[PDB]
Design an enzyme around this catalytic site. Structure first.
Site, PDB file in Angstrom:
ATOM      1  N   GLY A 273     -60.052  22.147 -18.334  1.00 26.11           N
ATOM      2  CA  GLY A 273     -61.423  22.374 -17.924  1.00 26.11           C
ATOM      3  C   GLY A 273     -61.594  22.156 -16.437  1.00 26.11           C
TER       4      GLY A 273
ATOM      5  N   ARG B 294     -66.778  22.731 -11.745  1.00 27.20           N
ATOM      6  CA  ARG B 294     -67.160  22.109 -10.484  1.00 27.20           C
ATOM      7  C   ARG B 294     -66.940  20.604 -10.480  1.00 27.20           C
ATOM      8  NH1 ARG B 294     -72.123  26.286 -10.825  1.00 27.20           N
ATOM      9  NH2 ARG B 294     -71.163  27.948  -9.569  1.00 27.20           N
TER      10      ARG B 294
ATOM     11  N   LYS C  64     -73.043   6.178 -20.380  1.00 30.68           N
ATOM     12  CA  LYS C  64     -73.350   7.387 -19.618  1.00 30.68           C
ATOM     13  C   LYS C  64     -74.595   8.077 -20.164  1.00 30.68           C
ATOM     14  CE  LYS C  64     -72.485  10.853 -16.777  1.00 30.68           C
ATOM     15  NZ  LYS C  64     -73.159  12.030 -17.387  1.00 30.68           N
TER      16      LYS C  64
ATOM     17  N   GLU D  82     -81.965   8.368 -15.640  1.00 30.77           N
ATOM     18  CA  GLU D  82     -82.061   9.386 -14.600  1.00 30.77           C
ATOM     19  C   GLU D  82     -83.217  10.338 -14.871  1.00 30.77           C
ATOM     20  OE1 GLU D  82     -78.756  11.999 -14.703  1.00 30.77           O
ATOM     21  OE2 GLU D  82     -79.552  13.378 -13.191  1.00 30.77           O
TER      22      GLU D  82
END
Lengths: 318, 318, 315, 320
Positions: free
Chosen positions: A10, A13, A200, A207
């Protein structure tokens, strides 16, 4: 000095930049993606003689052979792709080998995969990677879960991918105590397999809460000059100047605010639901995060149903 | 062209007004301080550099000892409400045409525009200053959002730039001055608009602060409750809150000043309502901040009513 | 003995129907709307010879003249239209006359208008009307606020529009002091001017909460057969049959559920004021807040956060 | 059909005994049994004479139900381990063809699992969500049940007996077309395979909790309009009972919950929603109202004081 060898599946970006940064720290990578174009691209982007392209997962398993353990970092779309790749790697890899999963996988899936791979002897590590594009230049905040032995073994590549002590000042109260000092370098062993992706997930929830708080604050500021108010009650405020002044010595200063200031100077959706499951599993109220996600977690049928009911209430059927 | 220092009176010498006076004296400016308690006004005189802080006994004494300058600047930081209103009225009675009155407290911005008009009748210039930083601002500078006339803003620019944090080491946002924006925002103090706009911006700032704070709170609550006994040990994670908060400060999306405070704490009010009121006035939805405010409101009757209705549903009256 | 006479300003699907119902109970009405076609249309739908059309508000004030007070029920779009109409009627009407406001007006506006019209001697009443199109045949649930004398005066015209005691069973325990018996007929004097629209506002809040509860329930039901689930964990449920069976002696049976059952077999942000009330009284309203913010959405507030997230993950 | 049926009933609480009494009042025979023999004989006495038979053990009623084509046993016990143990004991006692009805508040996944387990023994399993509570004895029970079409058509007499019926409730315009279950117009509905009845009952309880919380906070706003926290010029002393009463006549909020609220206000002036939220999460469905209603039932010891501590440290610092 010693360097380590990692396979990477994978090459987006984040995976491609992870490979490039690993090669910039002296480590060897065996990269592979679905499109060979980006595979050759990241091979060309890495340091000379440090990145090897693999055409199939069998090719990567063959190219990772050697004395030390074969570690394979998987950054694929979360869901069926990641599960299929992890099962195929559990079929291909050997006893001491290590499977790292950096995608946005459900943490219960990580626990299940660790339990399944422990039978085959394969160690499984779950990694939540935060930083996005800047992580290539500024290091990745990594929250991972796995066995203590596998953590101590994989520490070199994580310290290579970590930001380090960096420009951030140490918070008073981290001295002499029983804390993990590696947390001050950007990567933390949260616990057994599954805990890294769990923290996470909660990180992404926080967030989204902060992001929505910023959104409605700046929306109030913009709408202070809306026509729905009298002119004597209007303020034409500069959004960019406010976002810029807030960056320095204010309570709201943050990385999200830095992104907001840079954006204002230029001009699925239920991903959070897992978090609220963990919220109801533990009988903890989370009104702010729930509202923040339900601002974006919207159902078209659930809305047109209520709208039809209201129209039938005030207008009838015809 | 300004190469000297200024002389300012300061009414209200608390842990923020006294810090403002001390920071002004450390930056070269002279202050004429006075508080309701004589002990603390002599104390803040003793806290400033020698010969730069002068004590005043009454407001008339301050208005007298401040004569000589082009405009008498009087910064009042008293509890917002009746005290600050009485002080502003007394200053409007004591000060003259050219004099300037600055309100640094947590005053309602509508009161700011009202006082601005009323003192413009007397020719007195009125400025409202939202000061963010708390106790830390004494050493790290105060993020200031102020509103007033442009001429008065240019006049009090030395003292605001002195109390501001400055350019500092925080990186500049790319794309800033190419558009010709307000450069002073890059130092920590911003002229938001007419009188009342500064406290408005500060109020929305604290609303966003409460939103982010509640987000962090419920996030760390969900994290801590992973080791709660309400779950089976099969589904428990003993996570370290301090380590998670520390690793989050190293290049994660949630890295913030609030996260710094949270990490330090783990290793060791009024304006949200007005922000929601402004959101109502402007017809803008604020779900996150509304939920953060509802976390402060707690009604045991709101649940007792529904529970009694359910008890009557499944058990009946008679 | 006698009947009463009411002027009606604003002849929509609610004002025209209340006029027609007032005529069907023997009362005379003087109607007027901005579009003359619908005014002369409401005339004719009423009982023969008991409804008269008006062209202007001065024409209505002249057509309401007589001994007893002139009552003018205004059902115009809430905002500047209703405010302007009430301010005109304050100049046209005289001492003792009554101005009823049936629109979806802010209750603080009702209090302000009551204070403004008390100086001129004009009594002001605020009425929240619930029922919609169904109220023409089944009566209107009306929650109003005004003076006790004024409330007792307009009692015939409200009892005509009210559903009455009807077939609804009486709730046990309704024969003590302090209980307004007229509440058992569908219309209630809540208190001073402004309280009627206030309780109507909270009523709409409860309505939207229940509506979103139904929406989420039927969504969870229909998505039990969605392909996102394994076939071994799926149910193909019948929405119409569930909505029907829920009408017969269940805890969720309601009028909203009746509308839902009829619709299933047939197949802006005004609640924020409620929220403000909840904020003014330190009252948590999480359910109403969530239900409102399902329909209350911001374009800028959404695209801003999405741009910030796109910058986070892609730059 | 021109007769009555015989059903065993295990668990004689405020609903099991009421179900037995309603079945006997409608002509059916019941064979009841409870852990407390006193309440067993009490329920026998509360039924019509000769229509209720007491049983001391599960085997006793299993033998008392013999002779019929299929022995039907309705179980209304506390959901959890008690009901599971009783259902597996019945699977051990009953034979091929017999029917085990579960009327408790069992998780629907447990229902599909028990159905799969008992179908191998030839025993048909049906799950019945029963809504109405104690009122259903006089007004009928709204029943949402899941099972095979065969066992649904078999136990149809007893369900139509426990159902409220067509009654005076007006028919829905548009129910005359084909493709609809007409029994839904009587108060009981076959929802699908085993487990679907408790599933729709669970979603029903979730909607109930949502509407209940909505009414609660609405009346809270109304009552607090006269709170001392407001100025005298901004207060309304509203009558909660009068408002609840006037709302019953042709308003949008008119409901059975509103009737209960009005009857409660004249005297003074729950784990299904969590599983419904879990189902919404499993189906990627937003449930904001129900999620907020559930969070109102949770209490956060740390969720608020942590933020307040962080704010106190923000505005005051860390002394030591």
């Amino acid at each position: 000095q010693g360097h380590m060898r990692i396979g990477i599946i994978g090459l987006g970006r984040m995976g491609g930049n992870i490979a490039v940064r690993l090669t910039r720290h002296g480590h060897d990578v065996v990269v592979h993606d679905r499109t060979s174009e980006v595979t050759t691209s990241v091979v060309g982007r890495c340091e000379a003689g440090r990145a090897t392209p693999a055409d199939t997962l069998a090719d990567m398993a063959k190219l990772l052979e050697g004395d030390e353990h074969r570690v394979v970092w998987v950054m694929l779309p979360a869901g069926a792709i990641t599960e299929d790749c992890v099962q195929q790697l559990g079929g291909l890899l050997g006893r001491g080998d290590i499977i790292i999963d950096g995608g946005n996988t459900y943490y219960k899936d990580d626990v299940r995969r660790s339990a399944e791979l422990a039978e085959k002897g394969i160690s499984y590590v779950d990694v939540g990677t935060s930083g996005g594009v800047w992580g290539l230049e500024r290091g990745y905040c990594m929250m991972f879960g796995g066995t203590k032995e596998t953590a101590e073994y994989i520490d070199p590549i994580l310290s290579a991918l970590a930001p380090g002590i960096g420009d951030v000042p140490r918070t008073p109260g981290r001295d002499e105590a029983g804390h993990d000092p590696r947390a001050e370098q950007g990567y933390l062993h949260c616990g057994p397999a599954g805990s890294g992706h769990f923290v996470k997930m909660v990180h992404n929830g926080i967030e989204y809460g902060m992001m929505q708080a910023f959104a409605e604050g700046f929306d109030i500021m913009k709408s202070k000059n809306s026509p729905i108010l009298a002119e004597k009650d209007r303020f034409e405020l500069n959004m960019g100047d406010i976002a810029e002044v807030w960056r320095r010595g204010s309570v709201v200063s943050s990385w999200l605010l830095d992104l907001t200031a840079e954006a204002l100077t230029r001009s699925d959706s239920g991903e959070g639901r897992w978090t609220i499951e963990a919220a109801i599993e533990e009988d903890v109220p989370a009104p702010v995060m729930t509202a923040a996600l339900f601002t974006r977690f919207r159902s078209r049928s659930g809305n047109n149903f209520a709208e039809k009911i209201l129209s039938a209430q005030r207008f009838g059927f015809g």
